[PDB]
Structure formats: C-alpha cells, structure tokens
C-alpha cells in the first residue's frame, strides 16, 4: 500500500490527512463533504477547499427606505 505516498500532493487538514487533491485558496459551494468544513470537487484535477456558505448579499437599509415588488412569478416545487 505504498501507492499514493507522493510528496507533491500530500495535504493536512483538521479532518485528517488528505492525499492527491490539491489545496486551493479560492472558495466554492459543497461538492463532496470532507469533515470540518472542507469540501473536495473536480476542477483535469481534484481540489479541496474551505466551504463558502453562499454569496454575500447586503440589503441596503435606512430608517426611511422600503422595497415592494412590482411583479410576481409562480413556481412549483416537489417534495
């Protein structure tokens, strides 16, 4: 079981030793759950990154501003 003992792609995480998947500084959504908030995904390579919890969105707010819709969209959702 000496396979996958290469040193060029050996990583360390709070979830454990991770081999092969190259670590990146970017962030994305969940693809494959490793423990402790790290997820691995495909790309011609495998990468492992820290989770992104959804794109940041800030609501413009003040003591005298409102926002009411001007249109609707119907939708159907299974369960």
């Amino acid at each position: 079981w000496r396979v996958y003992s290469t040193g060029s792609n050996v990583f360390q995480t709070r979830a454990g030793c991770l081999i092969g998947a190259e670590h990146v500084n970017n962030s994305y959504e969940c693809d494959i759950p490793i423990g402790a908030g790290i997820c691995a995904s495909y790309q011609q390579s495998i990468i492992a990154y820290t989770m992104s919890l959804g794109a940041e969105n800030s609501v413009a707010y003040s003591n005298n501003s409102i926002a009411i819709p001007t249109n609707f969209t119907i939708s159907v959702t299974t369960e």
Binding site: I66, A67, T70, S75
Partner: protein, 230 residues
Amino acid sequence: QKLIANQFNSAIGKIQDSLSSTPSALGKLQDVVNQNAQALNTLVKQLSSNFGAISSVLNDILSRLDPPEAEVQIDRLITGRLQSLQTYVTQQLIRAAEIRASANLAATKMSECVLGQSKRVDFCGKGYHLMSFPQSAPHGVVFLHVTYVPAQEKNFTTAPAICHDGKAHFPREGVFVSNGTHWFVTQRNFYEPQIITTDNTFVSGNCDVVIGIVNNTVYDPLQPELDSFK
C-alpha cells in the same frame, strides 16, 4: 389572468423534465427500497455463515457427529441464526418508526396544503403558498406545491404615518410609499399605488407623537360631491 395561466402551465410542464433528467431526484424513496432489499439480502446471506461450527449446512451436521454430540453444533448454529433474526427485526422496527414519522408528516402536509391553504411560512416550499396537488409514487407521495414568489423589487422612501391638519393618518391595509415627489398607499405585496383618501386610511392621536411623520394632503371623496351640489 393570462400571465398567471401561462406561468402556471410552464411550471407544471417544466417539473416533468426536472424529474426526468435528474437521475437522483427521487432518492428519498429509492433509499427506502434499497434499504429494505439490502436488509433482506444480508439476512439471507447470513444463513450461510458458520457461527463457529464444523459446517454451515444443516444436514451435514446431522451426518457427521452423531446425535450425542451434534446437538452442541446444532445449538450453536441455532443461537447464531436467532441472533441474526433478532438484529434484522430490531432494525426493521426502528426503520418502521422512522417511516411512521415520515408518513405522519406526509398526512399533515396533505391535510394542510392539499385540502386547504397553510400560512406556515416554510411548510410548503419556498414562497407564499397558493395551493398544492398530490401525486402517487410507488412507496410515497409526491406533492406539487404552487407558490407565489415575488420578484423585481424597487426602492421607495416611506414614512410611518401621514400628517394632514395635524391628525396622524395611518394606512388601513398596506404601507405608505413615495415615488420621490408624491405619496401613495399600496398593498404590501404588490406595487399598485392609489391616491391617498380618507377611506384608504384612518386617524388616531395627533401630530406630535409619531416619530417619522411627513407632511401631505389627504383627499376626501365627499368634498367634490358636496361642492357639486354646493
């Protein structure tokens, strides 16, 4: 009505393709079927296990150790098989409890969504709930929640109340909104501005108490009719 009909028809169409294309859409039912079949198979496969005996075939025990001693091997096999059946039945009981909880939730969903309309804000899919339709599935029920999702919002500047001759006017239903120069009252979920009237609003207290009042004139529909007949 035309736009609502077209959107509803398009959604009811697209849901079919959504189920068709995705290979893992129905995972919650396939999980149940797979778990039951797998438990049954691993039960049967356990029949050929040894449990520490000279053999795993029953008849071989009866022809290789003679009744005075083969009873011990028979007893060991009996205990092993009985323990395996015990584990299978206990797993089945726990899974049946889980399915009972799921079925009670499904019954509540049927009663509330399908048979009526539920104000529970996130009990029937994203958005406000309009109606729902049930659909049968091999080991479950499939709902089609039809929900009203607002979109295309835009900014406005409001005040909590309107002052007019010193009497604090408030909206009867909805909220005052301003387009920049004028003032309007609108239903809280759709932008249909209507000129402010003494019928669209109500009064209470007076000017000095509310915190964010603004100055505007409030229409009075009785005045034009009264002035017509002087």
